[PDB]
Amino acid sequence: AIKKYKPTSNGRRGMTTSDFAEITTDKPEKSLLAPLHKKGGRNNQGKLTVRHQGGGHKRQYRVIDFKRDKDGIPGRVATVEYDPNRSANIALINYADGEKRYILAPKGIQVGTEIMSGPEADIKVGNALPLINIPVGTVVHNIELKPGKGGQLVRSAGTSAQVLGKEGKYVLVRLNSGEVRMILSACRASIGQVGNEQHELINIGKAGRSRWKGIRPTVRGSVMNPNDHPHGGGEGRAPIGRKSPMSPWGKPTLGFKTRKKKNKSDKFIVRRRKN
Amino acid sequence: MKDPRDVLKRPVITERSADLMTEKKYTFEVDVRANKTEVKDAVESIFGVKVDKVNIMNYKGKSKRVGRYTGMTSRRRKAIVKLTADSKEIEIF
Amino acid sequence: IYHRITTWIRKVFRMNSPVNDEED
Amino acid sequence: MKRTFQPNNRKRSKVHGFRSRMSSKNGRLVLARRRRKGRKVLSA
RNA sequence: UGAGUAGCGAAAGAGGGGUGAGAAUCCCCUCCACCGAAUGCCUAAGGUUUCCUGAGGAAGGCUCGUCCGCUCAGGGUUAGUCGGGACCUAAGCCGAGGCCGAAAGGCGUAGGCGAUGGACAACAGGUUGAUAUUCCUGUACCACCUCCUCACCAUUUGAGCAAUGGGGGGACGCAGGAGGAUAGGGUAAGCGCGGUAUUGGAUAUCCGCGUCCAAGCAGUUAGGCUGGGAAAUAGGCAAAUCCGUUUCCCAUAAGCCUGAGCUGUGAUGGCGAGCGAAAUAUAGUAGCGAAGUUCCUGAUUCCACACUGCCAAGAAAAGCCUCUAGCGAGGUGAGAGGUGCCCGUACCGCAAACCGACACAGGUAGGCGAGGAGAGAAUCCUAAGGUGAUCGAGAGAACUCUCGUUAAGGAACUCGGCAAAAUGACCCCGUAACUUCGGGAGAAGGGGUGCUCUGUUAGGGUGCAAGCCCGAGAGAGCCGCAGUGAAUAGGCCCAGGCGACUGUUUAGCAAAAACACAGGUCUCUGCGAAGCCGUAAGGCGAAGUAUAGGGGCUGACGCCUGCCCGGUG
């Protein structure tokens, strides 16, 4: 849910926050906590490769085995916890081994529900089983690109994916925004789209909340001096007279493909740019 | 080397030190690299007196210009050994 | 008593506002 | 008002120390220029 | 030369004596003045003796000078417990082999370095011309070691030590609100003082003082454990009677861990108002020494990020608590005996001992920071503690500056109500257009607050009472021009352009109609990324994953955002 704030002040006029209803416990387990030094977007050389990063609130990583390498062992969802690091909520799950591992949380999961990581596991949400056993068209999340590497795909909240069908090599998958790839059939994946779909609807409502993110402000390019930016110079709000809108780096950004025309992944691209 | 006897330099003759003579303690200059543990073995050998609580102090040198030519004083390091009760002094003698 | 004495002088600088206006 | 000279011995030592120059060949060149001229006080 | 002209560096001094060739400026005494949420102290940074005593004084003192942070002679910082190192770790850095690079070198494991953090045992008075949670007089505490003294045990059926290993714990955000107690202030009691000649007080008079720690011991404010016992264990690289997990038993508290600060012990000790010698090298100490209670008031401190709430969910490791692996022939449990090192300790640190060429109206963490009024670290006046802030004398011109005043008028001044004036303190009455319904709104516009009595009020705080306090409401009265009388604590009503706002910007001419922001939109990016920093390796993005990131454009919100792909991409 979304709790709208009354406009007691100018920053209250638009700001909104998620219900946090999924959250159960105020604190993370100590055993899986990890440090997160903030690079600030700087290179190891010390130069800032990425613009407007850092200055945000301190964060502490929770260990999360997306790989789910263990199998045949039933688990249980004890608690759910907020994750500063990403839009997706974290749900702690207690294994029958007594092992504990934070895991990505699809919506509609209930506390105490059983979850098997094995191939023989049921389709029921929260389970993760290999693509060969997956029925066509079922929603899937946290898909790995290769086995044992972890599921880079579909980690953010509210994202989803669907299977168009499968061969022995490779299983088809609908990636978000309609793109398709022949992901390896042996590769593991987890059924059920990620929760916290309401995160997109959240409104920041003030400059101050952005500082906590912390999203540093970005100067408009025309305002910038001509030496610093291609669109700079002029006598007040200079027209984008220069041919082809441009990044401060020389490559054009509006409609210009940044793809390498030759790539190993090009064979896997059955479909591209549905818009 | 090493020997206790060479550790000492000269006694510190000051009005502040003469008052300490009734305190059963006697100041002596000591090598800068010497430790308190070494000084305790020196009095027990040279004087033969039992040793209690030894204190040691270092001093940065003061400037002592001679005409155009300024020059830092050498860094003295006196030590204060509080001798045990009932023990004859060998100082001045 | 040696009574040695030494004197030191330095040029320094500088300002240049220069506060000059016109003709324009 | 605040001025450029705000002394800190740890900074003067870490930055302008003899080993700060020993750390790199260029600093060794600085020491070499320091010694060829016969300076009484090398480094800082 | 300008010149004996500018300046003499914010902001109280006066007198008496003393020293001396020389005294406004030095010293002492008596008044007076200024700071006192400091111009007070304590300690970093940094300075590196500038501290102290005895002398000198030509130069350095915006002036003389017997005086100096000056110039000369000696003298002065004392630590197992304070800070740091013989403990740890963060950012970051170095970095065996190694990954790369014409060379030089770059990158980065293992490992190490590195506090601004975590761990850690000593507190009260005294002492010098100084340095004192270091020296001293008391009481202590931690760690380690047995020529020792007792007590308990066990000889691989093994008394115990128990890891570089596994867990536990350490271990952490912001805001707010009750509570307990205390560092501190004041009242009644108590003890030492003085009867004051300026009218009047042995009197509800006056002045001054009103106590004391770490600890070894007992319990208490109260919080936290969510429960403890038994059995079973695909796990926590091997193992585990440890943890985690599972299943039952008992759950309204037996039990588990931590507490500020209190009562007696620490103390038949010393602080203490005041007396104040011999005299010594006549400073002024030695030395003597009373009461030492009670109530009110109490935090910004502590219990403690304990509790509640919230989002932006908020370090790392060791010291510790346990577990086994593993070591074993003498060990444990308490007393005595000893050991405990290396550096920093002076002074200046709101400043004449530093940043500033100066003995410069500026700049410099943090920790203590009182009283009367007051909401208050506002303001004014005063304690504790300092400061007489180092060129002056006297005339009382213009003129310049800092201010106070102003007859009749008012913004007729001026580019412009610039500057100045006025309003402003609490309680009460009352309050419009407009609006996103929050605002606007201290709207505007008015009234009352000084003193006395009925009134140790009505009502509350604490207390057995006694008492101390917080205190309206009113009535009657008294006065003055005056009444938050001093001092500081908004001037408003409108009408339009631009910009949502807070915020940011040219330090040192321009702070804004500029920038930014949330939002809106386009485009690109499928992870070995698009974009990058780099010859590369590596790394950022990212311990991310199209509801996520990069770039362009537009700027909250409301109504909207039309047509054109010929040309240029």
Numbering used by the authors:
A (entry chain BD): 2 to 276
B (entry chain BW): 1 to 93
C (entry chain AZ): 66 to 89
D (entry chain B6): 1 to 44
Please give me the paper's original passages concerning this structure.
The ribosome is the major protein-synthesizing machine in the cell that converts the genetic information present within the codons of the mRNA into an amino-acid sequence within the polypeptide chain1. In B. subtilis, the MifM leader peptide is located upstream of the yidC2 (yqjG) gene, which cannot be translated independently of MifM because the ribosome-binding site of yidC2 is sequestered within a stem-loop structure in the mRNA. Ribosome stalling during translation of MifM leads to unwinding of the stem-loop structure and maintains the ribosome-binding site accessible for ribosome binding and induction of YidC2 expression. The B. subtilis MifM leader peptide is 95 amino-acids long and comprises a C-terminal region (residues 69–89) that is critical for ribosome stalling as well as an N-terminal transmembrane (TM) segment that targets the MifM peptide for membrane insertion, presumably via SpoIIIJ.
We present a cryoelectron microscopy (cryo-EM) reconstruction of the MifM-SRC at 3.5–3.9 Å resolution, which was used to build the first molecular model of a Gram-positive 70S ribosome. Homogeneity of the MifM-SRC was increased by replacing Ala90 of MifM with a UAA stop codon, which arrests ribosomes at the first stall site, and thereby prevents further translation and subsequent arrest at downstream stall sites. The MifM-SRC has an average resolution of 3.9 Å, with local resolution calculations indicating that the resolution of the core of the 50S subunit reaches 3.5 Å. Only one tRNA is present in the MifM-SRC, located at the P-site, where it makes codon–anticodon interactions with P-site codon of the mRNA. The CCA-end of the P-tRNA adopts its canonical position at the PTC of the ribosome, with clear density for the MifM nascent polypeptide chain extending from the ribose of A76 and traversing the entire length of the ribosomal exit tunnel. In addition to the PTC (discussed later), four main interactions are observed between MifM and the ribosome: Two contacts are observed at the constriction, which sandwich the MifM nascent chain between Arg66 of L4 on one side of the tunnel and A751 (E. coli numbering is used throughout the text) of the 23S rRNA on the other. Two contacts are observed within the lower region of the tunnel, one between Phe85 of L22 and Ile74 of MifM and another between A1321 in H50 of the 23S rRNA in the vicinity of His68 of MifM. M90 of L22 does not directly contact MifM but rather forms a Met–Sulfur aromatic interaction with G748 of the 23S rRNA, suggesting that the influence of this residue on MifM stalling may be indirect. In the MifM-SRC, the side chain of E87 overlaps in position with the induced conformation of U2506, suggesting that the MifM nascent chain prevents A-tRNA accommodation by sterically preventing PTC nucleotides U2506, and thereby also U2585, from adopting their induced conformational states.
